Amino acid sequence: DLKKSRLRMSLQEKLLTYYRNRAAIPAGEQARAKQAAVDICAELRSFLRAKLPDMPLRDMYLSGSLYDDLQVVTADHIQLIVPLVLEQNLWSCIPGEDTIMNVPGFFLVRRENPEYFPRGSSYWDRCVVGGYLSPKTVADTFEKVVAGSINWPAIGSLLDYVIRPAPPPEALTLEVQYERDKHLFIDFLPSVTLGDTVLVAKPHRLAQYDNLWRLSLRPAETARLRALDQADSGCRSLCLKILKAICKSTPALGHLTASQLTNVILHLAQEEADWSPDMLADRFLQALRGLISYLEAGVLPSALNPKVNLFAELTPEEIDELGYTLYCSLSEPEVLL
- Three-state SS for 277-294 is HHHHHHHHHHHHHHHHHH
> In 3D, which of 65, 66, 72 has the Cα closest to residue 23?
72
Q: Which residues does the annotation place in the binding site?
A: 63, 65, 77, 216, 218, 244
Q: How was this structure determined?
A: X-ray
Residues contacting 186, CB < 8 A, separation 6+:
37, 40, 77, 78, 79, 80, 173, 174, 176
Nearest Cα neighbor of 99 from 78, 130, 137 is 130
Strand partners, 91: 111
- Tell me the binding residues for ADP: 63, 65, 77, 216, 218, 244
Report the C-alpha gap between 296 and 41 in whole angstroms. Answer: 42
For residue 112, which of 196, 189, 204, 195 has the smallest C-alpha distance?
A: 195
Write phi, then psi, for 205 (nearest 5 degrees): -55, -25
DSSP 3-state percent helix, strand, coil across the chain (nearest 5): 50, 20, 35
Neighbours of 266 (CB within 10 A): 18
Q: How far apart are CA 265 and CA 143, in angstroms?
A: 36
Q: Which of 128, 133, 129 is nearest to 109 (CA)?
A: 133
Q: Among residues 205, 165, 156, 157, which one has the least CA distance to residue 185?
A: 165
Q: What domains can be seen in the chain, in order of their start residue?
A: 1-24+217-337 (1.10.1410.40), 25-216 (3.30.460.90)
Cβ contact 108:93 at 8 Å: yes
Closest CA to 300 of 234, 208, 217: 217
CA 133 vs CA 1, 117, 211, 212, 214: distances in Å = 61, 15, 8, 9, 13
Per the CB < 8 A criterion, the answer to whether 194 and 93 are in contact is yes
Contacts of residue 207, Cβ cutoff 8 Å, sequence gap at least 6: none
Which residues neighbour 171 within 8 Å (Cβ) at sequence distance 6 or greater?
143, 165
- Strands (DSSP E) found in 104-161: 106-111, 128-129, 132-133
Among 79, 185, 90, CA closest to 132: 90
> Which residue type, as a one-letter code, is found at position 119?
R
CA distance 68 to 232: 19
Gapped junctions in the chain, after residues (C–N > 2.5 Å): none
Q: 252: which residues sit within 8 A by CB, 6+ positions away?
A: 321, 322, 324, 325
Distance of CA 227 to CAs 174, 221, 234, 235, 279, Å?
Answer: 32, 10, 10, 12, 18
d(CA 126, CA 131): 11
Give the whole-angstrom CA distance, residue 305 versus residue 299: 13
Instruction: Decide the pairing of beta strands 128-129 and 132-133.
Output: antiparallel
Strand partners, 215: 199
One-letter amino acid identity for 189?
A: L
CA–CA distance, 176 with 158 (Å, rounded to integer): 13
291: how many CB neighbours lie within 10 A of its CB? 21
- Phi first, then psi, for residue 56 (nearest 5°) are -70, 75
**Rounded distance, CA 32 to CA 74, Å?**
12
Report residue 66: phi and psi, to 5°.
-65, -30
